Symmetry: D2
Subunit: 236 residues, 4 copies
């Protein structure tokens, strides 16, 4: 797997290079973020994350914020054209370990826009989910991810009473592959937004939610529970 | 059987199954026998453009086909697309040839679906645009004879090495991801589609046409859908 | 005189000028006397949402009004908007009070205009979204009593210091830039609009309503357009 | 005036800091670009320019390309939130001096998208012109700019026969002011595209076309003909 992700790291794993507080981070082929920023996760409130990148500027940026709480931002110079293949799948991942939290997605949108050296926009791909059904046929649900419960996407397993389980991992990839770079495109850009609700019975809720982009055939790596966020096969 | 709604660009008049006696555009609602047609000039060798548009409040599906070097034809039909279509569909382009033939080349195709809720937000939306097609076009499901050739184009029907089209061919391209055409909380559901195309033939009676269509998610080319059936329908009912 | 097309959210029944005997929504084509209405429940103190939608091929203007804590009303009318409207227009929100009153508060407003040509491209497009309004809202033309208050909202009609609405008020907000509603090369012309709003009143008979409207570029509040005339019309013809 | 512009500098003025070849440049309050790149202008062919920026990454980027010719790119790190006022007008400018060229705009689009710390997009402004009429009521035409001739925007004066005049300057601003930064926006982004046709009877056609963003009340500065591009009152 080839993975680029923006993580909402709610649990600090200092032994695998995480900062010692909850943080947001940009991950380029490693759980050890290339850049992080402190982030004050807020139990039981709706937050929003935004991701943005264009192929000329070559800087991947993210922002996470609470209306009535904290906010954080992070940016990293990388060219995704040398990282990511031409065809990718876009997705959301989340996990728990010993500690947990609901990893509840209320909404998710993604917008890829490819402008050509002509008048026309060569390619484009845009979706919005503000609600999720029990049979969400345009999402590939991996692991413990389920849709529909309360018109929501629950990436990690939640029991009937509404309490989260540990040792869970799950993801939701958009059904169609995304032509992230196409020939004849002069400018390739994308942005993403998701709104989420992290609830928990733990003092260090865990482990986080991530927006990712990967090879089309990406799947949950073996043992990627907990600190690995359902994203990486190891902590290198 | 498959459930089909489609706008047809019908190059060949099959009067014996209810086509008008000239090339036309039509709105097909579960039958190749159009509910509504309009006279249409297919300009051999020219790039044309079709636009489709509908909303769930108005319940009136409409299409326009134009050539930048010719004229325009339009057709509109009253129909409640949720009373025909299932909740989840796929969207596609189909085309066919029979005893008479033509290239059914797609230069570009876009589709925009928006469902609006009780609030400001969209419960749901999908939009794609294609302005070229490569060899391995991973976001399209190609059926029958369709290929994504290297002129950067999508060829729906079989074209030989020299570039001349073959008879008795059928091909389609479905967008990869299912489309959520109905959402229970959705108050206003709309979509529009556009495709540019080049129909070229050495024939003075080119056949058979191209169609934008919406179908059940598992739709596939019916057996015996060549020629006048446009790769859409298993018969002329 | 001004040329007006508007969807009205009419909170007060003026039976004596052809309103139904209940609150309603209506499509007004050059006259306050709606061509089509539907029964409508205005939920005092609640945020509602209106959606408007039309295209030039279908020629059927449609609207939906919903409360997330109530129900929905819809109205549709066949009308060719180029046979009513000039080439260039402005788009706006209007509201009024008369002897009876209500707050006519706008929380959000969007408008999307797209005109499609002979080719893949849009000859022309305009889209705006407002999800809040400041004190100096430079992309809106405010008329009469309208203010862009500091609750981040647009107040169309006069509200006193304590927050209770006044009678005998009229206000409007027009988007700054003219809209090119007709283009000669344009084959498909569509638009959709959405606004969220809060009508609040201490009255058990609140009045008068809010309207999304389209008008000549130089339109202004007609004299005597308070109350049942919704800031739109100079009389009840 | 406060001016941020991306220029398509077809004529080199080495005495005011231009490179010694035609170039594209990013201008931040000065005709002396903060960054330039060589650009092989191509007489009598349709080209396309793209501009892009977001307020998190804080990098303004541009690309100019010909289908059957040359292409160029330039990027500059700047925060436009400390440069540009909250309200702006967006526009196109072009000029001639002793030397000229048709400064013909075939199409122009702009897209401002403001995402909030909620689900919603706080504000947005998007327009597309692929054709231009003799009474283009949503453009403020300044100086010699005219619309309609051949469904086009001619920013600089062109005689009846179709040959360009020298000592001309003109611009077209979009009628509505643009709330480029609004409060409660978490991410502010914009992009712009214009396609153009530069034709000339000169070996060093002149002087260039620019996409700009300015204070709402911006107007052609006195003597901004020629090398100043209708943008700046002087060459500082
Ligand atoms: C003992 O730690 C476990 O739980 C934490 C937090 O849940 C994870 O980060 C880690 O990988 C383990 O699964
Ligand atoms: C003459 O009839 C045949 O050819 C026409 C035109 O190709 C088809 O429509 C039809 O199905 C038959 O195959
Ligand atoms: C009772 O009539 C008055 O009040 C109603 C409701 O406000 C208005 O519609 C009308 O124009 C008059 O001013
Ligand atoms: C003599 O130079 C003149 O013409 C060139 C190119 O047209 C301009 O750059 C310059 O400002 C002058 O107007
Ligand atoms: Ca961690
Ligand atoms: Ca036929
Ligand atoms: Ca009334
Ligand atoms: Ca110069
Ligand atoms: Mn981390
Ligand atoms: Mn037919
Ligand atoms: Mn009424
Ligand atoms: Mn320069």
């Amino acid at each position: 797997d080839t993975i680029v992700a923006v993580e909402l790291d709610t649990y600090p794993n200092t032994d695998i290079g995480d900062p010692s507080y909850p943080h947001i981070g940009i991950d380029i082929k490693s759980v050890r973020s290339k850049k992080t920023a402190k982030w004050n996760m807020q139990n039981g409130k709706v937050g929003t994350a935004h991701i943005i990148y264009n192929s000329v500027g070559k800087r991947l940026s993210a922002v996470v914020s609470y209306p009535n709480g904290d906010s954080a931002t992070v940016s990293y110079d990388v060219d995704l054209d040398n990282v990511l293949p031409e065809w990718v799948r876009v997705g959301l991942s989340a996990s728990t370990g010993l500690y947990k939290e609901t990893n509840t997605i209320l909404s998710w949108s993604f917008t890829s826009k490819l402008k050509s050296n002509s008048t026309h926009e060569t390619n484009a791909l845009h979706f919005v989910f503000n609600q999720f059904s029990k049979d969400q046929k345009d999402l590939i649900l991996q692991g413990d991810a389920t849709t529909g419960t309360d018109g929501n996407l629950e990436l990690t397993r939640v029991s009937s009473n509404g309490s989260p389980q540990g040792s869970s991992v799950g993801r939701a990839l958009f059904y169609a592959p995304v032509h992230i770079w196409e020939s004849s495109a002069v400018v390739a850009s994308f942005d993403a937004t998701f709104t989420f609700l992290i609830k928990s019975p733990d003092s260090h809720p865990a482990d986080g939610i991530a927006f990712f982009i990967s090879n089309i055939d990406s799947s949950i790596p073996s043992g990627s529970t907990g600190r690995l966020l359902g994203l990486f096969p190891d902590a290198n």
